[PDB]
């Protein structure tokens, strides 16, 4: 069984959250630091180097705060 | 143990109906048009349950009724078409850009099912009623501050391959826009819908037939 609410933010408070989500509170899936209007860096996703001053969103920007 | 199977399925059927209601609200153009953005990922699942997985939104447009049929009776969720870059099975036929009056997705295509199959990335017209999730993640797509375009098969391959890589880096799943905290759906009845689903699920998992 898969809850339709499993990917929404209140699932973080479910008592089974840490037993069901491998990364727990560190999970990127439940991170509150993703800017929804900035594209993720395609150089990073491609294995190429960012240009100097790259202003895309990077994986280090979205790693959770708690 | 036979009246108890009845309670189990009654709970599952209440949950199924409330889920359909919740999905309709999230698919409603008043709530989602602002978030149908080129590069954002969309989970496409069709009317019959066929799961196309995650794709990349390329374009969005108001569906126009035919000549023939000025009032076709489309719901609001059926009144808009999202062009999504999806991964089709290698044996999927050519993609008909033009959806007819009664179609949610073109005919003759399907997701990759056979494990060997690498698939083929194509832009597929999908109704908003096929949107079963939106991601906070956006990928870079060719606008013309660049060049390139998804008419180019190699651009489609590259973007699709970066979609596979973003999925690999999200171990626990592509992050979903939360309908309250990211889409700002503030409706009082919508909060009630989510709470009722939660209460029923608590009852479902406490039932011994749940495993
Ligand atoms: Zn970069």
Numbering used by the authors:
A (entry chain B): 1017 to 1082
B (entry chain A): 654 to 864
Copy text from the publication:
Cryptic unstable transcripts (CUTs) are rapidly degraded by the nuclear exosome in a process requiring the RNA helicase Mtr4 and specific adaptor complexes for RNA substrate recognition. The eleven-subunit MTREC comprises the zinc-finger protein Red1 and the Mtr4 homologue Mtl1. The zinc-finger protein Red1 serves as the main scaffold for the entire MTREC complex, assembling the individual submodules, including the Mtl1 helicase, into a large complex. Therefore, Red1 essentially acts as an adaptor between Mtl1 and the various MTREC submodules to provide a route for RNA substrates to the exosome through the unwinding activity of Mtl1.
We therefore decided to explore different strategies, including generating a single-chain construct in which ctRed1pep is fused to the C-terminus of ctMtr4SA via a short linker (ctMtr4SA–ctRed1pep construct). The single-chain ctMtr4SA–ctRed1pep complex was readily crystallized and the crystals diffracted to 1.99 Å resolution. The structure was determined de novo using the anomalous signal of the bound Zn2+ (Zn-SAD), whose identity was confirmed by X-ray fluorescence (XRF) emission spectrum analysis. The asymmetric unit (ASU) contains two molecules of the single-chain complex, which exhibit very small differences as indicated by the low root-mean-square deviation (RMSD) of 1.02 Å for Cα atoms of 269 residues. The ctMtr4 short arch superimposed well with the scMtr4 structure, revealing that the ctRed1 peptide is positioned on top of the KOW domain. The N-terminal region (residues 1017–1024) of the peptide contains several highly conserved residues, among them Tyr1017 and Ser1019, which form hydrogen bonds with Glu854 from the stalk. Furthermore, Pro1020, Leu1021, and Phe1024 of ctRed1pep pack against Ile668, Met675, Met679, Leu847, and Ile850 of the stalk helices. These interactions are followed by a U-shaped structure (residues 1025–1046), which is positioned between the stalk-interacting and the KOW-interacting residues of the peptide. Residues 1047–1080 exclusively interact with the KOW domain, including more hydrophobic interactions mediated by Ile1050, Met1056, Leu1061, Phe1075, and Ile1078, which pack against Ile790, Leu792, Val819, Phe823, and Pro828. The middle part of the peptide (residues 1047–1056) is stabilized and held in position by the conserved Zn-finger of ctRed1, composed of Cys1057, Cys1066, Cys1070, and His1074 (inset).
